[PDB]
Design a protein around this ligand. Structure first.
Ligand SMILES: Nc1nc(F)nc2c1ncn2[C@@H]1O[C@@H](CO)[C@@H](O)[C@H]1O
Ligand SMILES: Nc1nc(F)nc2c1ncn2[C@@H]1O[C@@H](CO)[C@@H](O)[C@H]1O
Lengths: 331, 331
C-alpha cells in the first residue's frame, strides 16, 4: 500500500524504443521448415521489400494510447537520435520526459521478415535499450504520481525484472507483457515476471512457449495473476479469470493482411485504454481488436489513423450496435 | 561444343556480392520452435553482437579460390560502393573486371542471426544484385576465354537461370550451387538449374528441400548431373556418382565453432580448387574441409588466413600423412 499521490489516470509504458526495418518474403516460411531439420535450421529468405518505421513495443503502445486520447508516459532507453522520434510521439500526446537518452549507444534496431501468411522472423539489436536497467520507476512516480497501471513490455531483460520488482515494492498495478522477449528469457527469468500481475498478455504461441519454459501448468499461472489475455490470431482473443470464467471476443474482419508488426501492441493499448475508461472486459477487447486490425491493414506499427466515424461503423459491423455505441461514447 | 579459346584454367564465379551483418543469439533456435506452431512462426531473437563483413556467395568463393592461388573471375552485380570491396578482392588475385556496377542501387545486404548450435536465420535484401540478370556470360567469355568451370551460386533468381542457360548454350561446364536461394525458388525454378551440371553442391537440409520442392527422387537428379556433393555438417561430406559410387570425407576437427557463415562457400572453393589442380574427389574434399573449418573458426566469411605450414599439419592430423602431402604439393 503506497501513500503517494495518484497520477490519475496515467498508464506508464515500459519496454523497447526502436527503429524497425520491415521486409517481406514472397513465399511461406512454413514451406521451408522441414520438421526433421528443425534441430538446426539454416534459413535465408530473399526479400522483395525493405522499409523503416518507428517501433519498439513501448513506443507502439504509448503511441496508440495517445492517439486514443489516453494519458501516457513512455519509459525506456534510446540513443541520442531520439529527439526526432520524441517529436513524433509528443504530437500524439505522449509524455516522453522519462526516456533515458544514452550518451554513447544507438537506438535499438529491429530487423523483421514477414512471409505471405503473416508469419514473422526477426532479430533485435538492443544498443541503448540495454541502459533501461538504469531507469528507476521510483523517480518517474516521484515526478508524475502513481500510474494506474505500469506495462512491463519486452525490454532489456534485466530491466524487465527490475521494473517489475519496483512495481511490486511501490504497490503499482502492472501488466506482464513479456511477449517479444520470451525467446531470450530463461524459464527462471519468465517465472519472476508473473506473480501479482494485474494482466498477463501473450498470443497463444507465446502462452505455449511460456508454459513450456516455466515448467508451469495453466493453473500455476492463473493462481498468480488477476487476468490472462491470450490473443488467438484470426480466432480473436480469450480473457480468462482465475475461476476460470472465460470471455472470448472474435477479430474485426480485415480488408487486407498488410503487415502484422505491432498488432499485439495495438490490441493491448486499445484494450487497456478501454479498461481505464471503465469499459468491461468484453468491450475493452472489442476496442482492442479494432486498433489491432487498423495496424494489420497498414505498414509499420504507428502508421495507422484514428477516424472516429469509421471506428463506430466498423465496430457496429463486427460486434453490433450496442458494442459500437458503448465504446465510442467512452472515448 | 564451343570453338572459342580456353581461358585455362579460370573458374568464373557467378552469384551474390554483399555486405553481411552477422549477429549472435545466446540461446537455441530449436528451443523456441514449437512443432505445433511451425505453421505460422512468430520469432524474435534479442542478439548480443552485431558485426559487418564482406560477403555474398560469389565474393566468398572468389576470395577463397584467390587465396589458394587459383585463377578466378568474379561475375555479379554490386552498387557504386563496390570500389572498396573490389580492392579487397583484387588483393587476393580476384579478377573483378566483369562485376556489373549499378548506377542507382545499393550493394545487397545480408542480415543473419546465429544461435549457440550454429543454426542460422537470415534475410537477404538484393538491391543491385537484381541487375545480375543483365550480365551476359558471353561477354565475359569473349574477354577472358572459356572458363574451365562456371559456378552458378545463389543470385538474382532470374540471373541464376539465365547464367545456367548461357553455360548450356556456350558449352561451358557448370556447378549448380543454388543453396542459399532454395527457399525463394519454386520447384520449377530449381528443376531448370540442374540438368547437365558438372557438380551439384548442397548441404543435406538443402538436398531434402530440393527434392521436396522439385518433386524429384534422388534417382531423377543423379541421371542429370555428373556428381552430387552433399555436405553433412559435423559428419563431413558425401560425393556421389550417378552409379552411385559414394566417397565420404569426414570433417577437419574444429577448435571452435565461432561463426558458420560462408563455411559451405569455402568448402566449395577449396574442393573446386583441388579438382582444378588434378586432385581426385577424396583429396579435393579433404582440402575443402580444411578451408571450411578455417571459416568456421573465424568471424565473417573472408576473415580466415592461409598458412601453408599450418595447413599441412592439420590435414595430417585429420586425414594422415599421404593426404596432407598430396594436397600441399598441388598448391
Ligand atoms: N526481442 C525484442 N525485444 C524488444 F524489446 N522489442 C522487440 C523485440 N522484437 C520486436 N520488438 C519490437 O516489437 C515490435 C512490435 O510488437 C516492433 O516495433 C519491435 O521494435
Ligand atoms: N538468399 C540469399 N541469396 C544470395 F544471393 N546470397 C545469400 C543469401 N543468403 C545468404 N547469402 C550470402 O551467402 C553467405 C555465405 O554463404 C553470405 O556471405 C551472404 O552474403
Amino acid at each position: 500500500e503506497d501513500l503517494y499521490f495518484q497520477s490519475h489516470m496515467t498508464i506508464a509504458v515500459t519496454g523497447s524504443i526502436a527503429t524497425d526495418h520491415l521486409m517481406r518474403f514472397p513465399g511461406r516460411f512454413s514451406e521451408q521448415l522441414l520438421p526433421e531439420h528443425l534441430h538446426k535450421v539454416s534459413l535465408s529468405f530473399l526479400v522483395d521489400d525493405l522499409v523503416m518505421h518507428r517501433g519498439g513495443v513501448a513506443g507502439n503502445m504509448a503511441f496508440a494510447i495517445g492517439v486514443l486520447g489516453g494519458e501516457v508516459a513512455l519509459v525506456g532507453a534510446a540513443g541520442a537520435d531520439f529527439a526526432d522520434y520524441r517529436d513524433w510521439l509528443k504530437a500524439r500526446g505522449v509524455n516522453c520526459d522519462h526516456v533515458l537518452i544514452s550518451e554513447t549507444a544507438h537506438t535499438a534496431r529491429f530487423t523483421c521478415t514477414t512471409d505471405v501468411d503473416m508469419a514473422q522472423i526477426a532479430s533485435f539489436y538492443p544498443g541503448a535499450m540495454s541502459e533501461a536497467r538504469n531507469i528507476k520507476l521510483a523517480d518517474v512516480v516521484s515526478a508524475i504520481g502513481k500510474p494506474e497501471l505500469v506495462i512491463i513490455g519486452a525490454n532489456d531483460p534485466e530491466a524487465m525484472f527490475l521494473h517489475t520488482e519496483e512495481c511490486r515494492k511501490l504497490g503499482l498495478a502492472f501488466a506482464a507483457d513479456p511477449s517479444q522477449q520470451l525467446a531470450r528469457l530463461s524459464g527462471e527469468e519468465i517465472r519472476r515476471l508473473v506473480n501479482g500481475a494485474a494482466y498477463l498478455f501473450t498470443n497463444d504461441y507465446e502462452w505455449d512457449l511460456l508454459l513450456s519454459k516455466t515448467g508451469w501448468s495453466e493453473a500455476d499461472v492463473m493462481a498468480q495473476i488477476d487476468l490472462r489475455v491470450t490473443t488467438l490470431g484470426p480466432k480473436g482473443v480469450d480473457l480468462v479469470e482465475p475461476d476460470g470464467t472465460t470471455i472470448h471476443v472474435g477479430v474485426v474482419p480485415e480488408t487486407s493482411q498488410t503487415d502484422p508488426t505491432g498488432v499485439g501492441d495495438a490490441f493491448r493499448a486499445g484494450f487497456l485504454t478501454g479498461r481505464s475508461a471503465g469499459l468491461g472486459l468484453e468491450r475493452s477487447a472489442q476496442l482492442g481488436s479494432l486498433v489491432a486490425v487498423l495496424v494489420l491493414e497498414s505498414t509499420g506499427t504507428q502508421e495507422w489513423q484514428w477516424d472516429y466515424e469509421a471506428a463506430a461503423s466498423r465496430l457496429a459491423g463486427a460486434y453490433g450496435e450496442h458494442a459500437a455505441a458503448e465504446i465510442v461514447a467512452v472515448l
